[PDB]
Design a protein around this ligand. Structure first.
Ligand code: PSV
Ligand code: PSV
Ligand code: PSV
Ligand code: PSV
Ligand code: MN
Ligand code: MN
Ligand code: MN
Ligand code: MN
Ligand code: MN
Ligand code: MN
Ligand code: MN
Ligand code: MN
Lengths: 421, 428, 419, 421
């Protein structure tokens, strides 16, 4: 146990009275609205989102990085920290790895995961940066590089990621690359995309029968003029071209200003290509902020599309969910905790939507009542539900308060040496 | 017929002939030093055409107000007469695009007037984003994707009627742009609305002749301010792919999100054979509908760079339907359309100057600087002499607007047509 | 008088009274646990008012079309009658904002009708962004900043006329929003046009009563699509500062560039004493004019957070004018305004819940996570019971739209008014 | 000379004939337009823009940095490369320094500058990153940090930058900080700004009589929710509050999408607070791409406002122009060369605008002809003017071509050790 059980119990007891009052009050209010709070709590306690191994360390920008104390020294320390997030929130049982950052003996990774009670989600390849001993640089691209040998090298890297994933329990590979151009004319849009498609086809051939390949679009950064996989339109063409095992990953902060992201989600679901999500929040660009910290309603609206899919009876719909954020000015563990909480919060509210009433208002084109129907769900403070779900599953009623009460950060700060060079 | 007296055209051409010859010869020499035959460029420019919107020769407005000018066209016939001026002077707009019901009239007459004016008819445009007098079902909450079956049927019928009018006048395509969408979260179920849209478009597709095309046009927002069914090229692609070989996508420059790389969308659609055509205009904030190239000329060039790259790589079966789609709120509509058509040919001509072999080399070598400089060498070239010479050699005007103003046309039609009144927009 | 039958209000209130009592008491206990007196919050909420736009009572439209509903108001008097319903049910919109010349009519009759309906009048709104019948000079190329002196003079005169009408009905402010700008580079000389605008506004300020305020409203674009004279808050501040103590800036939520941090603009103006007022609405793309809070409710809360913080910091003489400015294109204008007024009070109420002492501590300690969580604890709170009780206690409806629909008001006016 | 004189002469003679033809042809066309090409050329050869010392090194993003060969390390290597840009373009005689990056003995710096034929422009302070041994971290801010000691440290740093500048010939201090927040509530907008103003007042007090203090606004990055100096409105408030010696710096890529930047320039000029403009281009965010490579007309429109003011000589109008870009996929020197070229190109074209005709069309509200009057100047290919100006002043007809013919990059590659072969 990363966090002492007596600490969790103590903090849970300190807040048990208040939780009871709020939960029972919300329960009665929901009952009057025709909703069974127990049914919602039962679903909420089973909603999981993967935690990025690279998210437990402090992030930075191209201008600077300001590390905190006890930064994880490697993947094993990172898994130890991810275990804290899972123990306290019980919403992050799985971790997403990034290769080569997390490269290590698969048997050891697996052993450590099992020991901490953590599993592994989709693998993430890295051909947007150069690793030591690389025969070819990814400066001008990787999977879509003009140089055949460079693409070949990138393909082999992704295949290696699949080999690592198979050994630790992963069932998917997420591919995000920086490929694109910074100047008009630098790249031939079509030829670069064709090159990408050919390389991804090779990677697709390396997929086990029960695996999935997720391509992730991004409007810009690191490429500032054009990006090969720039939006969901190109992403759909990729997935449709590759095959049944290929789907699209939607990262909230990767879209043009004012984009209606929830519609993109609906469109991908309709055509069965919604592979998964990368949750985070933003205001300007790919800010990678704590999910829901900026626009909680938008997050709720994305979940509204996910829940509606269930209501509509969409088959075989199991999108992969992962948090993909950068924590530059907070304790990474605390931000991941509250971010996981916001995601469950939006999910819970989406479950409260009176779909029967909504379908009626949609058919009668009663726009005002249709939107108010969504608002009645979103406006509901579901914190008591999230807290109870945690209490029942061995988590903390107030995760961050319990984390702080445990003195974990100070503990690891004394155990881990900060990098000097 | 000649809306503009030939003597005025000749007079104004001779007046600038000397200067033109000097500039054309200078550019010709420079291009020769660059291994380019100015004549080959001029020859292609003379043959580049862009359709003019019948509704573009009238003064436009916003939801706040409309400030009509003098001699506003009363209907399609006055509009065709004004369009004839644009074609006569620029020689770049031989075809007009009709919008129904605005331009509803006897097909025979339209065709007859067009032939007399030397104008053809491009893509037909349907209108289910507004209600017409005596209309049975309102399009307030949608049309082709409306929840009410009867409303969708009515919209479908309207589009089929547009195809019937087009066949009678020589058109070979239908362009479908609707305002369908929602202003509030929850108001519409994104998927169901799209399913309804797809089903209705399928019915319209069934009414297409074997040599016709059906163009769906995406738009991020307006009139819908929360979600729009056909919101972007992604949804538009799904539409074209689902409907069939005769269905393609139309790209309107000002219908994209801020900072969108529009030239890439063009390339992607060309790659998958779904680039039906373009709707030219410029913008800075939203769907501003400004004069093409008046705000970002380089972007217009970059879009044409993609068009010429395909046109040069022998991309078979590549005949995108180009059209100007603008709103002229503070200029004489005819003058704006004239210079807009000019800017479009300008971007086209400059795209033709690009050393494709050199560019390809720099792309393969990842020489980003030289690759971008290769495009700039073409873009920086002032091709106005080629544009002016092309017009002169084809019966047009060296300086179209100067000739237009010298003719006194606006004053003339102003005397022939009834006066208009300014007013507010649909805001209230 | 009462637009909505008093028996319908009592009926629809009694129908929901039991549930409200349960929700209000539960919220009261929760807030009590948080050291907050729910009664204190409700008291402030029932005192929060926002003006309703006369031009928002009718169905709005776009440059593509207008789809009116039934019983559309024929003029300002019908609009006042409809505004009376909004106030009767929400009790949050006692004042109406007029727009001249759209609402031109005998000022004396307007006041009389207002007094009879229990409505007051907020800031007057001038209109030199469209031409009126018989107008000598067109505003096509601008108004207060038009190159033609006679046109600027005419625009100034119109604004003074707006002040005359306002003085007769009890208005104490003039809001000036114009479309002046250019659609093409070179069309206007940015600086000279602004110099002309400043000179014309100086004339208006000269004729401004000493018990009145003058609000200039910035907008990034529309109707001008290349440049706009009063394009942002920076230019707006220069205007207010140049004109004088009685001149301030009006912030319309949908008038800023994509991704702009609007709440910061609000803070900056307060700090320099130039925040005159707000035009509330919501949006996603441009100046969409949608129901307030319908798209981004947190942003609305964050704007009010700055307003409540101004009081907490001890800023003096801060009494911003609040006004709804929306276009209802696909809903019953009355229902949208009702729920919009409600959303504004909702954001206000939540801002009142922020533990200022705790927040200040987290800010001083740079505890970003707890600071944001402190705002969230307030924002996540469902204050609907407070809003409903406030309405109930002041003669309004527990559920405004439900009571409105039960009254059959729309069908009624649909029969009294043309098609 | 960094570049051999014989190479410059050789590459000039190779292009002299064609240049003669083009220059004469343009001179004739301009003559028919009532314009004297010589008057334009004389002004162009005198238009200078400062080159950033940090611009000659290869740039990167938060994801990766792909260095090229012969990367300059330290201010001395950088000055050596900056000299190349000045010798070939003759448009960048002054270099802008950044402290503590370019820290060195002032006398030695001044000596190296004089030897290379380079002067020194505005000094640039750095409190957006932590230097080793630093007593207080700038993680949560600098000049506006809540901690008094931290603000004092940032103030002292800025004063030290002025001291360094006074010793090498600089006459201004540019202050751009990352200060802001990533979460609502994290900062109190007003108190943070009050702290900033108070700290800047302390810096202002240390300014010599002939020095200027430039504050730079930026919408976002590194702060992703709010930034203290977020736009020109706040920037104007700062300059007006501080005093006559304080002005605002406008960086093209630091504005919200669709912003009309040329108007901001005009407004600042009208109120005498336009301190300078930092050139670069962009399409998405603060891309820091080569000036005019994405939107050359916008660059021309900015210069239209500058030239209109330069013609009349407005009070307080004496801009301190600098290039501020990041070269992630090109030879930094080549990009800086062509960027300086684009800046002079836009300046030259603005010089061609018929102000009298323009003024007329503006007064008559003839929008079409007004915009056409600007286009007639913009559509003019002034390359012959830029090339001749360089030829007459000791520069190269075709800078990049001459640069590549000299083999300079290969030369420094052999003198400077890369991290890896
Ligand atoms: O942290 C880098 C990750 O961020 C991205 O979203 C790119 O910004 C990709 O998913 C990468 O894996
Ligand atoms: O005038 C409306 C036209 O504008 C559009 O671009 C919609 O904005 C469509 O093409 C319509 O046909
Ligand atoms: O309805 C027009 C109003 O909208 C505006 O916000 C302009 O868009 C102004 O405030 C006007 O008064
Ligand atoms: O390289 C960092 C420079 O970039 C900036 O524009 C910040 O983006 C500032 O001017 C800094 O000096
Ligand atoms: Mn991602
Ligand atoms: Mn990302
Ligand atoms: Mn269009
Ligand atoms: Mn359009
Ligand atoms: Mn407004
Ligand atoms: Mn508005
Ligand atoms: Mn800068
Ligand atoms: Mn910058």
């Amino acid at each position: 146990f990363r966090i002492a059980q007596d600490v969790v119990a103590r903090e849970n007891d300190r807040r048990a009275s208040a939780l009871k009052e709020d939960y029972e009050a919300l329960g009665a209010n929901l009952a009057r609205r025709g909703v069974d709070i127990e049914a919602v709590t039962a679903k909420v306690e089973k909603f999981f989102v993967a935690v990025p191994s690279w998210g437990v360390g402090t992030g930075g920008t191209r201008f600077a990085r300001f590390p905190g104390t006890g930064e994880p020294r490697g993947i094993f320390d990172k898994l130890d920290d991810c275990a804290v997030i899972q123990q306290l929130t019980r919403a992050t049982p799985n971790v997403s790895l990034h290769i080569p950052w997390d490269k290590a003996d698969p048997k050891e990774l697996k052993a450590r995961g099992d020991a901490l009670g953590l599993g592994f989600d989709a693998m993430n390849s890295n051909t947007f940066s150069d690793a030591p001993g690389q025969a070819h640089s990814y400066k001008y691209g990787s999977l879509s590089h003009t140089n055949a040998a460079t693409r070949a090298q990138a393909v082999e890297h992704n295949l290696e990621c699949i080999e690592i994933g198979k050994a630790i329990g992963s069932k998917a590979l997420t591919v995000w690359i920086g490929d694109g151009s910074n100047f008009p004319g630098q790249s031939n849009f079509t030829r670069a995309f064709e090159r990408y498609l050919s390389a991804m086809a090779e990677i697709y051939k390396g997929l086990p029968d029960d695996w999935k390949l997720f391509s992730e679009h991004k409007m810009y950064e690191p490429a500032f003029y054009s990006t090969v996989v720039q939006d969901w339109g190109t992403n759909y063409l990729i997935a449709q071209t590759l095959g049944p095992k290929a789907q699209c990953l939607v990262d909230l902060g990767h879209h043009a200003p004012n984009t209606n992201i929830e519609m993109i989600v609906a469109r991908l679901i309709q055509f069965g290509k919604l592979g998964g999500f990368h949750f985070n929040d933003s205001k300007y660009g790919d800010d990678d902020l704590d999910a829901g910290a900026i626009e909680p309603y938008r997050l709720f609206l994305v979940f509204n599309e996910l829940v509606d899919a269930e209501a509509r009876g969409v088959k075989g719909f199991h999108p992969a969910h992962m948090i993909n954020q950068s924590h530059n000015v907070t304790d990474p563990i605390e931000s991941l905790i509250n971010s996981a909480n916001e995601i469950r919060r939006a999910y819970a509210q989406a479950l409260l939507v009176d779909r029967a009433a909504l379908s009626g208002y949609q058919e009668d084109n009663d726009a005002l009542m249709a939107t108010e129907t969504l608002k009645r769900a979103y406006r509901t403070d579901v914190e008591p539900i999230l807290a109870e779900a945690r209490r029942r599953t061995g988590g903390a009623v107030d995760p961050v308060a319990t984390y702080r009460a445990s003195g974990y950060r100070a503990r690891v700060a004394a155990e881990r040496p900060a990098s000097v060079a």
